[PDB]
Amino acid sequence: TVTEPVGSYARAERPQDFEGFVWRLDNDGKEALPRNFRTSADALRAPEKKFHLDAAYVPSREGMDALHISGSSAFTPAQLKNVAAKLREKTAGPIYDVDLRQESHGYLDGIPVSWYGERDWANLGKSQHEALADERHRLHAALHKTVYIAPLGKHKLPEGGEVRRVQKVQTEQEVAEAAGMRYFRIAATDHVWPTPENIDRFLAFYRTLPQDAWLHFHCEAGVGRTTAFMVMTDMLKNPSVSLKDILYRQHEIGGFYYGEFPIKTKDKDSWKTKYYREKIVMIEQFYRYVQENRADGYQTPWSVWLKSHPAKA
Amino acid sequence: TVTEPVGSYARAERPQDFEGFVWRLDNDGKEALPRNFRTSADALRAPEKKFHLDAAYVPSREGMDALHISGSSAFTPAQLKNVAAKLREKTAGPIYDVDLRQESHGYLDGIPVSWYGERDWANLGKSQHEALADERHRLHAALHKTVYIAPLGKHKLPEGGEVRRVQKVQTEQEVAEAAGMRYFRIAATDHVWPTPENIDRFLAFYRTLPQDAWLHFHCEAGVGRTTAFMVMTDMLKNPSVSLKDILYRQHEIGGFYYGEFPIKTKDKDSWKTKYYREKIVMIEQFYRYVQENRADGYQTPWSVWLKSHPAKA
Question: Which residues bind 1D-myo-inositol hexakisphosphate per the record (chains A, B) (predicted)?
Answer without folding.
Answer: 24, 156, 191, 220-225, 272, 276, 279
